[PDB]
Design a protein around this ligand. Structure first.
Ligand SMILES: *C1=CC(=O)N(COCN2C(=O)C=C(*)C2=O)C1=O
Ligand SMILES: [Cu+2]
Ligand SMILES: [Cu+2]
Ligand code: NI
Ligand code: NI
Lengths: 128, 128
């Protein structure tokens, strides 16, 4: 099975996917984020952050309050299982993490922590 | 009948209303916009813009492309029936327009033209 996925965040504030499935046979999983828009990071910056469904709100609130210089993520936030950098137009970034950090039966959410974006930019991630 | 309405745009990128009814007995209509959030205009700026449902997309595209210095509205856009200024946290602005600019049967939309916000920040306005 494949253990990577390519995701896009555009100017309309949206991911080209709302659900991800991580095959249990994967040892590591990679996410390739790319920004096909024309707006700069400071106004339409997108990052891909993964946490349990329960931790999402907390991560989003503290992240938005941390500012652009911190890529909108409270430093040393242990709730973030994995995440890419905040990218602007024409930029791209990848993250690879150990699938052992995921458990079956648990509910995970991926989302962008740029002020207000998680309202639309979010989706589910499951270990099947 | 009342001829004004108070609207709020917060940090969660949302209006506290999605439908406005302008009573035909009104000669003028006023909209009081206020920003109860803490985020600045440059990151979570909100404006209240009115156009026909059909002109909305056009207005939004040309507006987002106009930048913060223009309050995200293409200069001299004749599609904009009325609008307030773009406001940041703790700011407010009112707009009053002639109800004679509205006709019955026509579908109107109000929305924010800050990059990507119209996806969630929009609503209907009707002359009944
Ligand atoms: C992209 C990065 C950046 O700093 N910037 C300018 O932002 C200016 N302002 C402003 O006027 C109020 C808050 C703020 O960041 C970009 O366009
Ligand atoms: Cu985003
Ligand atoms: Cu807005
Ligand atoms: Ni495989
Ligand atoms: Ni009246």
């Amino acid at each position: 099975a494949e253990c990577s996925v390519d995701i896009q965040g555009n100017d309309q504030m949206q991911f080209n996917t709302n659900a991800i499935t991580v095959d249990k046979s994967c040892k590591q999983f990679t996410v390739n984020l790319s920004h096909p828009g024309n707006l700069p990071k400071c106004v339409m910056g997108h990052n891909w952050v993964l946490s349990t469904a329960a931790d999402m709100q907390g991560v989003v609130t503290d992240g938005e309050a941390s500012g652009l210089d911190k890529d909108y993520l409270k430093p040393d936030d242990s709730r973030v299982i994995a995440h890419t950098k905040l990218i602007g137009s024409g930029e791209k970034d990848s993250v690879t993490f150990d699938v052992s950090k995921l458990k079956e039966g648990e509910q995970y959410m991926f989302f962008c922590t740029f002020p207000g974006h998680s309202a639309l930019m979010k989706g589910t991630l499951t270990l099947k």
